Design a protein around this nucleic acid. Structure first.
Lengths: 549, 49
DNA sequence: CCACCCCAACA
DNA sequence: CAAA
DNA sequence: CCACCCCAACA
DNA sequence: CAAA
DNA sequence: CCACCCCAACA
DNA sequence: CCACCCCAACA
């Protein structure tokens, strides 16, 4: 029974240089995991209604009231980048390869360890002895039939360790349940009251209570037991490791230069606007670099800081990423935002239960939109636009001062384009199911790859209940022995990508590691410390042009 | 755009003992889901811990 | 004996 | 159109 | 003797 | 992806 | 020994 | 079941 192992340990990254710059990247990782005993061996329908940030008047974007359901089952997510790659690899990848895809994924578990603890030592100070239970279990449920919801733990930064030589932990599986809410708007102090702040009883219509021990099979794993899945093949679209910058003013034949400089420090000049040949969609007589007809609408003006509503009511409305103009609208061009803990970054030697993030500002420049240059004219596009014939960024709307029109605008015409949300080395996600909606989003912001068909089945792990001498279920609270366990986990993630060309003349930007300054990109940041702490800093993947038009 | 049935389409002068019948028209449309949803935006992903 | 505004989803 |  | 920013729609 |  | 909320990507 | 800082002294 007990004695021999069940698995190996591969946290290697294998490269294969095929024919025609068709590389095959096979990443592995064997993380050792610790899983304790669920507090409850029940299913609970728990609700949260923070009436301490909900009973204010301005605190709307602070609504955290949701009706959740807890499962004694502990999940296992590895849908992250940091778990599959190293700082180097990525560098070699993003820095060399053009595009990239996602192939297979083969998860495996082995060398299961199960131990018990007996709080002893009353005839002294206090000591907890640890011994094994070579008869114990560890229910493993792999829900591929994707019957249950899809909870990408990477969501709430609840994944698997990034440091392959550091024991990590799982994420207790919990899923959403139908309730119903109604919350009204209100500013700072406003007068009167809010009126109603109601939850929602069972909507015996949208109710959807599941049970792992009902829908998915369980493979009671002991000690000498090995659980392993099959090779899940992916059917997703590639991802381009290249960034653009071709705006609308940088697409087509530049104006004809009738005059050229005569020596550095003397630019050229075009010819009489209203005498210049070309087309335009404006009824004036003079083509400009702004008027002139182009192929499409680079990037679109999305209302920033919306805030929509429904049955759980609020909720900010995302953005599809886009640079943060020379004005750093950073909140419009919906640049994101992350907050991770040690087990996913942080100065692995910091203090204060204070997270840490790194606002991601896309590269897909020439796409972004500056909100500090809005601008809209009227009928006869009179250039020297009067005032009553324009609407700038300062012109109030709704009678609210700091409330502009760019906050409502929405320019998503059948003449719109834009780049896909690029990956994000550490933290960042990988793949993500797809909303089972008749019609669907062009993309998900939450991940560069979206399986087109079913998706990987989630892998749920639980300790098996270890009982004592007593147990009459007609017992309010039942006694169980303190049982916990180790198992390793290994992962196969396969990708296949192409090798970039070199079409320019000018070198191009890359990722490097500088001396040790203070610059974001400086070793020390990565290599350990006297003791042995370790950071991971999200890096750029896409450093390199792509001549859009 | 003035049309005339008695110009574009054929007419089958049916009497009493006459039977008019069409062929089996096969459809090429997308299915329809007899299921309703309720997963807002606040009900998509990992609930808070 | 219904196929993409005609003969003609031709035969 | 990135595989085949 | 023009195919998806190279060789090379290869042969 | 609902047929095949 | 993971395919599209079951058996069952069936065999 | 150890070969020239990866897969792979490949099979």
């Amino acid at each position: 029974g007990v004695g021999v192992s069940t698995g190996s340990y591969d946290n290697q990254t294998h490269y294969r240089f095929l024919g025609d710059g068709w590389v095959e990247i096979t990443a592995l990782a064997t993380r050792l995991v610790h899983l304790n005993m669920p507090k409850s061996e029940n299913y609970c329908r728990i609700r949260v209604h923070n009436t301490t940030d909900t009973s204010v008047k301005g605190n709307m974007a602070k609504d955290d009231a949701h009706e959740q359901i807890w499962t004694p089952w502990s999940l296992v997510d590895a849908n992250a980048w940091g778990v599959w790659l190293q700082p180097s690899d990525w560098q070699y990848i993003c820095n060399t390869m053009s595009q990239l895809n996602l192939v297979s994924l083969d998860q495996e578990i082995f060398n299961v360890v199960l131990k018990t603890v007996t709080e002893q030592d009353s005839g002294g100070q206090a000591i907890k002895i640890y011994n094994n239970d070579l008869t114990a279990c560890m229910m493993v449920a792999v829900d591929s039939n994707n019957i249950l919801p899809y909870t990408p733990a990477a969501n709430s930064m609840e994944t698997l360790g990034f440091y392959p030589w550091k024991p990590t932990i799982a994420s207790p599986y919990r899923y959403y349940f139908c309730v119903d809410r109604d919350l009204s708007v209100t500013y700072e102090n406003q007068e009167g009251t809010i009126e109603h702040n109601v939850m929602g009883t069972p909507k015996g219509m949208n109710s959807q209570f599941f049970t792992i021990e009902n829908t998915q099979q369980i493979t009671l794993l002991r000690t000498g037991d090995e659980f392993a899945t099959g090779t899940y093949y992916f059917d997703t679209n590639p991802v381009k490791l290249t960034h653009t910058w071709q705006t609308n003013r940088q697409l087509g034949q530049p104006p004809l230069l009738s005059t050229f400089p005569e020596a550095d420090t003397d630019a050229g000049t075009l010819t009489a606007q209203g005498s210049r040949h070309g087309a335009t969609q404006m009824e004036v007589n003079w083509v400009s670099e702004a008027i002139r007809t182009r192929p499409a609408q680079v990037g679109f003006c999305q209302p920033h800081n919306d805030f929509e509503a429904s049955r759980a009511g609020p909720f900010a409305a995302p953005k599809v990423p886009a640079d943060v103009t020379q004005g750093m609208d950073r909140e419009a061009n919906g640049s994101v935002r992350y907050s991770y803990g040690k087990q996913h970054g942080e100065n692995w030697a910091a203090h204060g239960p204070a997270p840490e993030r790194y606002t991601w500002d896309e590269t897909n420049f020439g796409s972004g939109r500056d909100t500090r240059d809005g601008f809209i004219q009227s009928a006869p596009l009179v250039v020297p636009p009067p005032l009553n014939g324009i609407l700038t960024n300062a012109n109030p709307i709704g009678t609210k001062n700091d409330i502009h029109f760019s906050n409502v605008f929405n320019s998503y015409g059948p003449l719109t384009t834009f780049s896909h949300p690029s990956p994000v080395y550490p933290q960042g996600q990988i793949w993500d199911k797809e909303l089972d909606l008749e019609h669907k989003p062009r993309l998900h912001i939450t991940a560069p790859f979206v399986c087109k068909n079913n998706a990987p089945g989630q892998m749920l792990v639980r300790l098996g209940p270890n009982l004592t001498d007593q147990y009459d279920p007609n017992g309010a609270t039942l006694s169980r022995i303190v049982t916990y366990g180790t198992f390793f986990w290994k992962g196969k993630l396969t990708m296949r990508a192409k090798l970039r060309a070199n079409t320019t003349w000018n070198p191009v930007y890359q990722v490097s590691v500088e001396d040790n300054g203070n610059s974001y990109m400086s070793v020390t940041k990565w290599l350990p410390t006297a003791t042995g702490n370790m950071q991971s800093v999200p890096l750029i993947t896409r450093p390199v042009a792509r001549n859009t038009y």
